[PDB]
Amino acid sequence: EKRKAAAAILSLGNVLNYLDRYTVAGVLLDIQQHFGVKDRGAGLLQSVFICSFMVAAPIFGYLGDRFNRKVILSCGIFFWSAVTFSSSFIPQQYFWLLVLSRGLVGIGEASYSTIAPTIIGDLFTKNTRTLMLSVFYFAIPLGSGLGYITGSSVKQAAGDWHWALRVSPVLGMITGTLILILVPATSWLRDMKALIRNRSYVFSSLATSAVSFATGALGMWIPLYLHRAQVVQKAKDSLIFGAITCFTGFLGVVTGAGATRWCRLKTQRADPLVCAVGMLGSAIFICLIFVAAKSSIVGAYICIFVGETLLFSNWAITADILMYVVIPTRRATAVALQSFTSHLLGDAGSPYLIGFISDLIRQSTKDSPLWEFLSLGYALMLCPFVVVLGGMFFLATALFFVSDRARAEQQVNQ
Numbered sequence: 203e204k205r206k207a208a209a210a211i212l213s214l215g216n217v218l219n220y221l222d223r224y225t226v227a228g229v230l231l232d233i234q235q236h237f238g239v240k241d242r243g244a245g246l247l248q249s250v251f252i253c254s255f256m257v258a259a260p261i262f263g264y265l266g267d268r269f270n271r272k273v274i275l276s277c278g279i280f281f282w283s284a285v286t287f288s289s290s291f292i293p294q295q296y297f298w299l300l301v302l303s304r305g306l307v308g309i310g311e312a313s314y315s316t317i318a319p320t321i322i323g324d325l326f327t328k329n330t331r332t333l334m335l336s337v338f339y340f341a342i343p344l345g346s347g348l349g350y351i352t353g354s355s356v357k358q359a360a361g362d363w364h365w366a367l368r369v370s371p372v373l374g375m376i377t378g379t380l381i382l383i384l385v386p387a388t389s390w391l392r393d394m395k396a397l398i399r400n401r402s403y404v405f406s407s408l409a410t411s412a413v414s415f416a417t418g419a420l421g422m423w424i425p426l427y428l429h430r431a432q433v434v435q436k437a438k439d440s441l442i443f444g445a446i447t448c449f450t451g452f453l454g455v456v457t458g459a460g461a462t463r464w465c466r467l468k469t470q471r472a473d474p475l476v477c478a479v480g481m482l483g484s485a486i487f488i489c490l491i492f493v494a495a496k497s498s499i500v501g502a503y504i505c506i507f508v509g510e511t512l513l514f515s516n517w518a519i520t521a522d523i524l525m526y527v528v529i530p531t532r533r534a535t536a537v538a539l540q541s542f543t544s545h546l547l548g549d550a551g552s553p554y555l556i557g558f559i560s561d562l563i564r565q566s567t568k569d570s571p572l573w574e575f576l577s578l579g580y581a582l583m584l585c586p587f588v589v590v591l592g593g594m595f596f597l598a599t600a601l602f603f604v605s606d607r608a609r610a611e612q613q614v615n616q
Contacts, residue, residue, distance in 0.1 A: 263538025
């Protein structure tokens with residue numbers, strides 16, 4: 203009953219992780235009002251955060267292979283919590299201090315999100331491990347929902363940037379202690395070469411990159427698309443989309459876990475297939491969004507719901523695949539490179555790519571609300587192709603799964 207409590211504590215640490223990730227996402231406009239900055243100011247915040255996360259993922263993966271592991275995790279939690287509690291004090295004259303605060307939070311929670319999954323993998327076994335990974339990733343939509351609700355409620359109580367980043371840090375330090383204590387006692391180029399040899403791991407990383415691309419592009423650009431659709435047919439839409447995203451994340455994790463349990467109990471290659479089937483079923487509904495909204499009078503966009511569910515169904519299953527096809531002393535590096543790749547090819551630049559394509563499409567016709575709707579519609583129909591591509595990579599992983607699992611067990615069991 204110590205390992206189960208420790209997995210619960212790591213999951214709560216992840217809840218706090220995403221709460222600190224999305225409190226600023228909630229309070230970005232109020233930050234703009236306080237600092238007197240433009241939207242490119244918040245663009246700098248998010249871009250610097252993702253850049254620092256990407257850069258500090260391989261280092262913390264490297265140090266997660268060799269030296270103490272729980273120490274790195276607790277020190278990372280204390281790191282971003284103390285950095286945030288520090289940055290809240292900053293006056294209005296400098297905004298780059300807030301940007302550096304975003305960078306430091308990025309480094310700390312890159313350490314956490316690169317170390318914790320390997321601990322949860324190392325603690326448990328087949329059913330308990332997949333359940334605990336499902337919990338660890340269920341903590342994501344829960345964290346985002348709490349980020350939004352915290353930002354809005356605190357702004358209603360008192361609306362400023364100051365009052366946003368003061369809530370989580372103390373609970374962060376509490377969970378840093380409760381991970382340092384409760385958690386049960388815990389060259390690099392060769393590892394990189396061995397991992398890039400592993401075909402299943404490569405294909406799973408590419409599939410995760412496509413998943414992150416789709417999630418970032420949809421989760422940013424959809425609310426504007428829905429507003430344009432309501433304009434064509436003839437804020438709050440962001441709130442509705444956020445609630446939909448959180449509830450669909452819950453439902454997707456649940457459905458993926460159940461379907462994986464059944465298919466594994468039947469066959470031998472269930473982990474990648476139950477991802478691929480879900481991904482393609484999600485792409486179909488994501489397109490069904492766009493074939494809808496032509497008549498929202500009857501339409502209800504539920505295709506977003508039943509597309510996001512199926513798309514999020516494969517969070518924990520990809521982690522399961524990675525733990526299956528990578529030996530214990532390369533799990534940290536594998537997770538780090540997976541995060542780096544999924545960020546680089548995914549949400550780091552994907553919304554901006556969609557924006558560039560939307561600008562290119564709208565350059566033909568003279569600007570019109572209906573024309574904006576159509577242009578952004580094509581730009582966001584670009585994403586279902588990415589989802590289908592990720593599904594095909596999941597099929598390739600399904601091809602190589604047993605072979606690479608056996609090639610891993612031959613090495614380990616010696």
